[PDB]
Amino acid sequence: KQYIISEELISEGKWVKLEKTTYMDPTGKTRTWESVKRTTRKQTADGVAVIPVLQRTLHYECIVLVKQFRPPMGGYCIEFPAGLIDDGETPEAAALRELEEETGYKGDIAECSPAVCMDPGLSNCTIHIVTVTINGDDAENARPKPKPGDGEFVEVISLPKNDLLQRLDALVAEEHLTVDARVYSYALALKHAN
Amino acid sequence: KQYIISEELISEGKWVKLEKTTYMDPTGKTRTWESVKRTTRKEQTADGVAVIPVLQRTLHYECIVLVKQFRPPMGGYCIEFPAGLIDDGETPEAAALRELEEETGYKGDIAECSPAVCMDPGLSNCTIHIVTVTINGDDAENARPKPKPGDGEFVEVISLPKNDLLQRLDALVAEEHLTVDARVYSYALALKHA
Ligand SMILES: FC(F)c1nnc2c(C(F)(F)F)cccn12
Ligand SMILES: FC(F)c1nnc2c(C(F)(F)F)cccn12
Ligand SMILES: [Cl-]
Ligand SMILES: [Mg+2]
Ligand SMILES: [Mg+2]
Ligand SMILES: [Mg+2]
Ligand SMILES: [Mg+2]
Numbered sequence: 001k002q003y004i005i006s007e008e009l010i011s012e013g014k015w016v017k018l019e020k021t022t023y024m025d026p027t028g029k030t031r032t033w034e035s036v037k038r039t040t041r042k043q044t045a046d047g048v049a050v051i052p053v054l055q056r057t058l059h060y061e062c063i064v065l066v067k068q069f070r071p072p073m074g075g076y077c078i079e080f081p082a083g084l085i086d087d088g089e090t091p092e093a094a095a096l097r098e099l100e101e102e103t104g105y106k107g108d109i110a111e112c113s114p115a116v117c118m119d120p121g122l123s124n125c126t127i128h129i130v131t132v133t134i135n136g137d138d139a140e141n142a143r144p145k146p147k148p149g150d151g152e153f154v155e156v157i158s159l160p161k162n163d164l165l166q167r168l169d170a171l172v173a174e175e176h177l178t179v180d181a182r183v184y185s186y187a188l189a190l191k192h193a194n
Numbered sequence: 195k196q197y198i199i200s201e202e203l204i205s206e207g208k209w210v211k212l213e214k215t216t217y218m219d220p221t222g223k224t225r226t227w228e229s230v231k232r233t234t235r236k237e238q239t240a241d242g243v244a245v246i247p248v249l250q251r252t253l254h255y256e257c258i259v260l261v262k263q264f265r266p267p268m269g270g271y272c273i274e275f276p277a278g279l280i281d282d283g284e285t286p287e288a289a290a291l292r293e294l295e296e297e298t299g300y301k302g303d304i305a306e307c308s309p310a311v312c313m314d315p316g317l318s319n320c321t322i323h324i325v326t327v328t329i330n331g332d333d334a335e336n337a338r339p340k341p342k343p344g345d346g347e348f349v350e351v352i353s354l355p356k357n358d359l360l361q362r363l364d365a366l367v368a369e370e371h372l373t374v375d376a377r378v379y380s381y382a383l384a385l386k387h388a
Contacts, residue, residue, distance in 0.1 A: 002264035002271075002348070011205030011212055013228040016317065018205050018212050021266040026348050033266035034207040036230050036317070049376070051383065069196035070315035071215040071227035076196075077315040113383075114367055116376040118314040120265035120272040121242075122210065122230070125314055129379055131387070153196070153220045161387075172309050181244075181311040182380040184324055188246060188308075189381040192326070192356070193388030 001026035007035070015039060036123040042087045045115040045126035048094040049082040049182060052107055053161065056136035060160035064134065065183060066102050067155040078157060078171060079180040082127070095130035102154045104144030107132035129182070165191050195220045201229070209233055230318040236282050240310040240321035243290040244277040244377060247302055249353055251331035257353040259329065260378060261297050264348065273352065273366065274375040277322070290325030297349045299339025302327030324377070360386050 003024055010018040021033040038046050052064035070077045083098040085091060092109050099107050110131040118125035134141055148154060159167040165187040168179050179187075195218070202214040215227040232241050247259035265272045278293035280286060287304050294302045305326040313320040329336055343349055354362040360382035363374050374382075 004266065004269045010207060013204065013212060013214075016212060016228045016230060018207060018210060018230075020207070021269075023264070023266045025346055026264075029346075031266075031346055034209040035267035036210060037267075038317075051380075051387075053387075069217070069220075070312070071198070071217045072229035072231070072317055072319050073312055073315045074198045074215075074319065077312050079312075079315065082316075113374075113379050115373065116379040117265070117268055117272055117274075117373045118376055119318065119320060120268045120274065120373065120375065121277070122232070122267060122320060123314065123317065124267050124269065125317065126373065127376060129376065129383065131383065151219060151225060169309075178310065178312045178315065178321070179308075180315065181313055181322060181324065182376050184308055184311045185246075185377040185380040186384040188324065188326065189384030190388050192246075192248070192381075193385050 005030065010034075012039060036125070038125060040084055043085050044091055045085065045128050047082055047084050047125070047127040048091050048098060049080040049127050049129050050095050050099045050107075051080055051129060051131045051186065052099055052103065052105060052134055053110075053132070054105070054134045054136045054158055059136070060162055062158040063161050063164055063186070064103050064105060065157045065159065067157055067177065068153065073178055075176070075178060077178045077180060078168065078183060080183055091128035091130060095128070095132060099132055101147045101149060101152070103156050104146040105134045106138070106140045107134045161190065199224065206233065230320070232320060234279060238280040238282070239286060240280060240323050242277055242279045242320075242322040243286050243293060243325050244275040244322050245290045245294045245302070246275060246324060246326045246381065247294055247298065247300060247329055248305070248326070248356070249300070249329045249331050254331065256356040258356050258359055258381070259298050259300060260352045260354060262350040262352055262372065268373055271370070271372040272375060273363065273372055273378060275378060286323035286325060290323070290327060294327055296342045296344060296347070298351045299341045300329045301333070301335045302329050356385060
């Protein structure tokens with residue numbers, strides 16, 4: 001019933017552009033929308049996000065998260081490890097690479113989502129969500145070495161999976177951080193499964 | 195130790211703008227970023243709300259109520275939590291109950307309300323509250339519920355059992371061209387991982 005008629009460039013930066021989208025509404029009326037896209041997609045999706053489950057014997061299972069300054073937010077955010085997929089990179093390879101660069105952890109693919117939308121009211125941005133387990137008892141994960149890219153500055157925050165939502169609420173309360181919506185959504189469903 | 199130095203407008207639409215963000219990196223060095231923001235954010239604690247609507251009915255499994263809409267930015271149909279922008283002077287809780295009734299017909303009861311969480315913090319300043327609402331599907335109000343879609347709003351309601359959410363989403367994606375929202379996928383993944 002609905003579809004794109006045309007896109008008009010409003011403004012293109014190096015990494016992001018603003019388009020004016022003309023589309024057919026399901027009554028047969030023509031309508032316009034202001035749409036954000038990345039200029040970087042070549043790719044099943046723009047990015048991967050990694051759900052990293054740190055498994056250590058005789059410890060609570062943890063979810064490994066990252067804290068970073070986010071210039072669009074003007075502040076620090078708590079997020080799943082994540083990055084853009086390199087041209088010709090698989091989502092799985094991107095996941096293990098981003099997880100190792102951001103956390104220094106070496107993990108195993110458990111499962112990989114299809115492309116899922118980040119904010120479909122505003123952007124065409126998509127990611128693969130990639131569930132990875134980390135054998136925290138293996139020697140390679142003893143002293144995990146975070147290898148940042150140029151300009152990346154990442155703090156690792158491991159939180160017990162069984163209390164994730166309460167732990168995130170605490171950090172926000174004490175640390176004035178913004179929690180990522182996908183991290184918060186995961187933490188909610190862990191509580192709601194009960 | 196990182197902070198914003200300046201925000202230079204690049205391009206302002208009616209609904210979205212692109213900014214050149216200048217910030218201090220943690221080595222004491224000036225860098226820039228391309229940042230997306232909405233033009234619509236006034237005194238709201240966030241741009242929007244997304245609703246996690248748990249439909250509860252005697253001798254039924256709990257359903258998660260989802261909506262399917264054409265999203266011009268994506269050029270296609272997306273499956274999302276009911277969601278909308280917070281009106282000037284509207285509370286996140288009132289926005290969530292209003293958007294839930296407008297998009298699905300269902301009259302919910304507030305359960306919980308997140309702090310402001312970031313939609314895509316590497317790209318935008320966009321934030322939502324994630325509001326968990328229970329719907330009493332035994333109430334006569336919620337019997338044959340009628341969406342009240344706004345102007346140029348066309349929403350289909352999809353209620354899926356919480357206990358099978360991820361496989362039910364996977365089956366919808368296998369049967370037509372559509373994108374699942376990243377927050378819905380993150381929530382369905384955590385239900386499986388619990
Ligand atoms: F920011 C973009 F998402 C965007 N572009 N158009 C809109 C509208 C409009 F009513 F104009 F269609 C409402 C809300 C957001 N919009
Ligand atoms: F698209 C915007 F999110 C955006 N602005 N700058 C960047 C960079 C840069 F390396 F330049 F810093 C990398 C990735 C995305 N960026
Ligand atoms: Cl798992
Ligand atoms: Mg990253
Ligand atoms: Mg990285
Ligand atoms: Mg909406
Ligand atoms: Mg609406």
